[PDB]
């Protein structure tokens, strides 16, 4: 029952890249010119865990270049992955502390929030017409401003970013609405193993607090745990 709705689809949104931010490596460069050309160049992009081709948990529903960067709307659909998450969320004291202000607890949305607090794009190395490959949920992307906001509804998600203008939501909405088995080929052991890998990423929380402040999700209310 409460589990049935716990394992329901979960939407995820955020910038894959921020034009105002200059990456730390020239291979992370991705300016508006390139993004918009590529978009007009390009079947939806798969959505996986930490770029794991065996850990695909959904698909990207909308992609849009906006004033401040490239924004993408995605949806976690894999029943297998969602179930794994549901089970773990019951064992997270972090998830047990509950959400902020007036938001209602959502153990699962909250868990994804805490584990894959970031988004990481996978595109062709700038230095035939399928530039983008996929988007990956991860503990922290290499590109700043890439905070990941999980939610049960697309509108509610896009509505978490102050930058986005009502007009941007329309481009996205146009997309995710027209978009509409289980691609997951991993398990809990994988995620767990993948979790230790994240315990050793230097400055994980600082980069996330930064990404949260830069993209204005610090301003609103969400299930973001960073």
């Amino acid at each position: 029952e409460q589990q049935s709705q716990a394992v329901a689809p979960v939407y995820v949104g955020g910038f894959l890249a921020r034009y105002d931010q200059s990456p730390d490596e020239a291979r992370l460069l991705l300016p508006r010119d390139v993004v918009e050309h590529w978009l007009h160049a390009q079947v939806a992009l798969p959505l996986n865990i930490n770029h794991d081709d065996t850990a695909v948990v959904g698909h990207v529903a909308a992609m849009q270049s906006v004033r401040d960067g490239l924004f993408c709307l995605g949806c976690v659909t894999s029943p297998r992955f969602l179930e794994i998450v549901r089970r773990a969320s019951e064992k997270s004291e972090l998830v047990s502390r509950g959400p902020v202000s007036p938001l209602q607890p959502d153990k699962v949305v909250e868990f994804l929030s805490g584990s894959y607090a970031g988004l990481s794009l996978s595109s062709r190395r700038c230095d035939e017409t399928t530039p983008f490959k996929h988007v990956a949920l991860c503990s922290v992307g290499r590109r700043r401003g890439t905070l990941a906001v999980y939610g049960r509804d697309p509108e509610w998600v896009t509505q978490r970013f102050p930058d986005l203008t009502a007009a941007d939501r329309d481009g996205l909405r146009a997309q995710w609405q027209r978009c509409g088995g289980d691609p997951f080929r991993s398990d809990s052991y994988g995620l767990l193993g993948n979790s230790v890998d994240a315990l050793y990423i230097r400055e994980r929380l600082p980069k996330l607090r930064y990404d949260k402040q830069l993209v204005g999700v610090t301003e609103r209310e969400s299930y973001v745990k960073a």
């Binding site: 894959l16 890249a17 291979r27 992370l28 770029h51 990481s120 794009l121 996978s122 595109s123 062709r124 190395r125 700038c126 490959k133 990956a136 992307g141 290499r142 590109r143 890439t146």
Partner: peptide, 4 residues
């Protein structure tokens, strides 16, 4: 490919 570049993965972020």
């Amino acid at each position: 490919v570049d993965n972020a």
